[PDB]
Design a protein around this nucleic acid. Structure first.
Ligand SMILES: Nc1ncnc2c1ncn2[C@@H]1O[C@H](COP(=O)(O)OP(=O)(O)NP(=O)(O)O)[C@@H](O)[C@H]1O
Ligand SMILES: [Mg+2]
Ligand SMILES: [Zn+2]
Lengths: 568, 153, 311
DNA sequence: TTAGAGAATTGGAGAGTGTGTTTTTTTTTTTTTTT
DNA sequence: ACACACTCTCCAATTCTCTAA
């Protein structure tokens, strides 16, 4: 009762098992005193007691979970770490009851905010996949990794058996495909999430879990297998998966330099040679414009949509894979998952019908059995296609080379055609670059730095951070001076289109020009569009419009349009 | 350290005189020692099997130990303390009881051995201890052990 | 120790490459080109990836086209009888579910052939609805399942060996291989090598071929007399696959010249950048066959010469 | 040494009580509308 | 309400013991 053990007295487990030793009153009181003495006293090398600084922020966020690193608990009072690894279900009860004392020392009457606090363990120093688990692991703490395959809804559950409840949710976890050995199927396990941990993860995420490994009787398993076979589950204890002023100043430094637009385009898709216009269009789509709306009868999207007609083997699928790794959020082939992101299509009636609705709208609506509901698309579409068989025909307009309705070609902001042209010098350049890249990739720090800096003019980590910063912070606008010239150019282009008997230029093209100019302003972190932005946007759209036409019309257009496609 | 439980040794045999086919399993050989070969087609995940059990009474502080299972989950017949008569509300002490690793696998006859006009038969095999997850689907294997008979639990 | 001694002895030989080619499929008369292709597929290239995280395919796909009685199925029969990881499948009697994977989840043929050779016989009889499944798997070396609330992704690092019939049963020398073969252009674009077999009637060949066939029916084992034992050859192939050779400087200079020659011949299936990548794979396999850690330019001359027989 | 009168221990007859029961493929032959 | 599983209770069949002829 009154007397307490020394820490050295705990070195000898005196009962027949760990659990029956931890649960004794004098041992338990000793452990409680020692844990409280650790939590009030552990330090950085700089002093600066971390847990006194964490409890402080627990109340600043009105939170419920205190987080403890295992390495700190192993760095002093090692026996408590050993007992925690062996008997988590007991040790964590004592530790939670100590954590409440420590928090009330900062914030008296915190019990009125939350009645009970949970300790979360981090950095447990050994890991298993779902292969290595065996019966010896039962009731031990484990650390596991995988992909979350399926998730239930959240429900309340009765806490005690006057009443009290807690939140509950189950998650199915599967081995990551990179970990699975060759020629074997992946394994599965199911995880239980309680009060603070529900909806911490989403289906398809790759996730890391710490918790107790636990089992129970199940009648159906016994009945079907015909042997006394128990079922097992994991009870999670913790689950795992911005910028400074220095980054902002660095971004602004590079943006202040001349030619930053060209350098960003050059950094785009380093492994692919040539095809600068495709890289330009992809960069413009990833940065995008600004959305606008006028409740008097009109709305304008900020997203930029691009379509690429590809000869066989002209790098299309590689740049889509590159964009998939570059972009913040994306879908590859579902438009709900592409919300405020980029959507990627590499090959191609109901699918096309869905895309017809998606290009007309920015939000999707559906009804079924009298139910009615709505969803958001709000995304930029990058698509590629094979031109109606083995090879494109340049003598014909674009419609002859595609399996698309006319409004698709109207509503795509940018159209482009890529062809396997014949040139000895280009072939030699391609072949030299290809074998050079092949050698540079061979499995057989300084080597990496040289390789990286030869690969690109911008480090791509900085470029991804820069794209995210620009997308979240920069919102450009037009300047009202040069817009008279834009209107005159629009009228001139329409007059020339009619004069040669071309299909006419339209308001959609003018809108696309303004949107692309906004994107060009965003690329250099400029809140103003400028004359050169309008010039570049005009060149892109005019050249794209010219590429869609028949050959005789193409010659008349380029002869007249020289003062836009090349001059300004 | 606290006390350490006993090691569950396993005896194993090899180089038996002859190998039978799945088609040669017949009820006269039940409980004898044999060897078999075939192609693996399915495998189950590893599960814990209850080997020896230990229970404690709800109505009084009493404990029952080393209860033996065979094919179905089995519990005590009396309260050992004569001051109590309750037979209900036992709980299995997971710390004091002992488990084993268990895996089910499924095999079918070798294609080159099938007789004229016939089709391949199949069989279910049990693996335990340090031999679980050794087998792989689509591989060819040789097994040895004893054939048994399992009830309708 | 004796295995190491025997392996060292055959490794030391000057004429090892020719003997290895000669020891593939002992019962088939002639057709050394296909045998060489089978050996290089069996050894394989070197798998690798770039700094960008994109992967570069390290293995070889082959297709054999021929009019009837050309013994083309014997190559598939030998391969599935020899290679440690392999499966044989007929294009008529199989389903997309049975080829990739099926709900019951249970593995299909391409899963069992992971890190192995998968044999498709009478490919031209397969339904388009299932050819596209093989195309999607071959594009990614990956298989995907999503149905009934169950989702899964699986790896399929499998090399394909296929056999097919020309349309109408006999090949037309007036026409491209695309005209002769009932196969869609994206699938055709993904075979590293195509082999076309033709009867080419000639008394001096017939008189020998008939003798060879009659000897096989007259003596069971005695006729073939291969350069090596099968259990010797498998040990050699296991040993060879441990090498990871590196491309020499002179070979890099030589490759672009040979590729320019192919492009000028092209200026028939149109020659793309993929042919250069395939040629690199073949050169890696050739160097590996010889147990050499450097790609000598002679190996690229060999690879270029072998590749142009498919055109 | 037999036997008969009285006491203690056990068996199971049979009476009573509570309980449970109805009731997304994947593969293969055939008809039908659709390009 | 209709076969079952399980519990409870009373009564007489049985064997054991003591006494006297
Ligand atoms: N700079 C390059 N230019 C062209 N091709 C390249 C280049 N670098 C690599 N390649 C290869 O050439 C192909 C690039 O085009 P890609 O579209 O990805 O091939 P593909 O998908 O098989 N053709 P397709 O099926 O019609 O899309 C790949 O096989 C690449 O490995
Ligand atoms: Mg592609
Ligand atoms: Zn009791």
């Amino acid at each position: 009762l009154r007397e307490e053990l020394t820490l050295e007295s705990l070195s000898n487990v005196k009962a027949n098992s760990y659990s029956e030793w931890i649960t004794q009153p004098n041992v338990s009181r000793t452990i409680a005193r020692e844990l409280k003495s650790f939590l009030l006293e552990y330090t950085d090398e700089t002093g600066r007691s971390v847990y006194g600084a964490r409890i402080r922020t627990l109340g600043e966020m009105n939170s419920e979970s205190l987080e403890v690193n295992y390495r700190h608990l192993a760095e002093s009072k090692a026996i408590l770490a050993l007992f925690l690894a062996k008997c988590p279900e007991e040790m964590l009860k004592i530790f939670d009851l100590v954590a409440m004392e420590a928090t009330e020392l900062h914030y008296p009457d915190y019990a009125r905010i939350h009645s009970e606090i949970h300790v979360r363990i981090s950095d447990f120093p050994t890991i298993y996949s779902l292969r290595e688990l065996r019966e010896s692991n039962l009731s031990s703490l484990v650390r596991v990794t995988g992909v979350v395959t399926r998730r239930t809804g959240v429900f309340p559950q009765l806490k005690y058996v006057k009443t009290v409840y807690r939140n509950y949710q189950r998650v199915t976890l599967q081995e990551a495909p990179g970990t699975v050995p060759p020629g074997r199927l992946p394994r599965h396990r199911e995880v239980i999430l309680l009060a603070d941990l529900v909806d911490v993860s989403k289906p398809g995420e790759e996730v890391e879990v710490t918790g107790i490994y636990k089992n129970n009787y199940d009648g159906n398993l016994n009945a079907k297998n015909g042997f006394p076979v128990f079922a097992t589950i994991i009870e999670a204890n913790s689950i795992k998966r911005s910028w400074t002023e220095e980054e902002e100043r660095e971004f602004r430094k590079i943006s202040r330099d001349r030619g930053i637009i060209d350098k960003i385009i050059s950094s785009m898709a380093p492994s692919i040679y040539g095809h600068r216009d495709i890289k330009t269009a992809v960069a413009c789509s990833l940065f995008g414009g600004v959305p606008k709306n006028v409740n008097g009868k009109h709305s304008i999207r900020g997203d930029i949509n691009v379509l690429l007609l590809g000869d066989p083997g002209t790098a299309k699928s590689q740049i889509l894979k590159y964009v998939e790794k570059t972009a913040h959020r994306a879908v590859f082939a579902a438009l709900v998952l592409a919300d405020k992101g980029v959507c990627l299509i590499d090959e191609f009636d109901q699918d096309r019908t869905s895309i017809h609705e998606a290009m007309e709208q920015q939000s999707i609506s559906i009804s079924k059995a009298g139910i009615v509901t709505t969803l958001q698309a709000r995304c930029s579409i990058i698509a590629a296609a094979n031109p109606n068989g083995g090879r494109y025909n340049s003598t014909l307009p674009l419609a002859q080379n595609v399996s698309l309705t006319e409004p698709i070609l109207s509503r795509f902001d940018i159209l482009c055609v890529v062809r396997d042209l014949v040139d000895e010098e280009a072939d030699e350049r391609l072949a030299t670059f290809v074998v050079d890249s092949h050698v540079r990739s061979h499995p057989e720090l300084q080597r990496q730095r040289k390789k990286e800096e030869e690969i690109s003019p911008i480090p791509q980590e900085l470029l991804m951070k820069y794209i995210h910063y620009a997308r979240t912070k920069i919102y450009p606008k037009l300047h009202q001076m040069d817009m008279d010239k834009v209107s005159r150019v629009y009228a001139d282009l329409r007059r020339e289109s009619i004069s040669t008997g071309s299909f006419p230029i339209t308001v959609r093209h003018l809108e696309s020009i303004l949107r692309i100019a906004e994107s060009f302003a965003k690329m250099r972190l400029s809140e103003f569009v400028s004359s050169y932005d309008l010039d570049r946007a005009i060149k892109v759209v005019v050249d794209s419009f010219v590429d869609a036409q028949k050959v005789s019309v193409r010659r008349q257009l380029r002869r007249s349009f020289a003062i836009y496609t090349l001059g300004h | 350290s606290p006390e350490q439980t006993e090691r569950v040794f396993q005896i194993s045999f090899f180089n038996l005189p002859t190998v039978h086919r799945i088609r040669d399993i017949r009820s006269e050989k039940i409980g004898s020692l044999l060897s078999i070969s075939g192609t693996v087609t399915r495998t189950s995940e590893v599960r814990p099997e209850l080997y020896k059990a230990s229970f404690t009474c709800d109505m009084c502080r009493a404990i029952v130990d080393n209860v033996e299972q065979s094919f179905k989950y089995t519990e005590p017949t009396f309260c050992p303390n004569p001051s109590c008569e309750n037979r209900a509300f036992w709980t299995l002490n997971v710390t004091r009881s002992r488990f084993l690793d268990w895996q089910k696998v499924r095999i079918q006859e070798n294609a080159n051995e099938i007789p004229t006009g016939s089709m391949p038969r199949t069989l279910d095999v049990i693996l335990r201890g340090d031999s679980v997850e050794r087998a792989k689907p689509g591989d060819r294997c040789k097994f040895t052990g004893v054939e048994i008979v399992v009830p309708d639990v | 120790s004796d295995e190491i001694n025997e392996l060292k002895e055959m490794v030391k030989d000057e004429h090892i490459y020719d003997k290895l080619v000669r020891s593939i499929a002992p019962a088939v008369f002639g057709h050394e080109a296909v045998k060489k292709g089978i050996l290089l597929q069996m050894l394989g290239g070197v798998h690798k990836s770039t700094v960008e995280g994109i992967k570069l395919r390290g293995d070889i796909n082959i297709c054999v086209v021929g009019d009837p009685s050309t013994s083309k199925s014997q190559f598939l029969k030998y391969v599935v009888g020899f290679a440690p990881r392999s499966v044989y499948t007929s294009g008529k009697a199989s389903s997309a579910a049975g080829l990739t994977a099926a709900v019951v989840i249970e593995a299909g043929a391409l899963m069992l052939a992971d890190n192995g050779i998968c044999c498709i016989d009478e490919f031209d009889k397969m339904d388009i609805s299932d050819q596209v499944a093989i195309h999607e798997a071959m594009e990614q070396q990956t298989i995907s399942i999503a149905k009934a609330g169950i989702h899964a992704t699986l790896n399929a690092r499998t090399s394909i060996l296929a056999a097919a019939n020309p349309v109408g049963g006999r090949y037309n020398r007036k026409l491209s291989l695309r005209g002769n073969l009932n196969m869609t252009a994206p699938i055709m674009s993904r075979f590293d090598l195509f082999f076309v077999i033709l009867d080419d009637c000639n008394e001096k060949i017939d008189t020998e071929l008939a003798s060879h066939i009659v000897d096989l029916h007259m003596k069971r084992d005695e006729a073939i007399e291969p350069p090596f034992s099968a259990e010797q050859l498998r040990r050699y192939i296991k040993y060879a696959r441990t090498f990871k050779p590196i491309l020499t400087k002179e070979a890099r200079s030589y490759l672009v010249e040979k590729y320019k020659e192919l492009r000028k011949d092209d200026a028939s299936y149109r020659i793309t950048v993929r042919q250069l990548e395939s040629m690199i794979r073949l050169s890696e396999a050739i160097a590996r066959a010889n147990c050499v850690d450097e790609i000598t330019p002679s190996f690229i001359a060999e690879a270029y010469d072998l590749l142009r027989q498919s055109i």
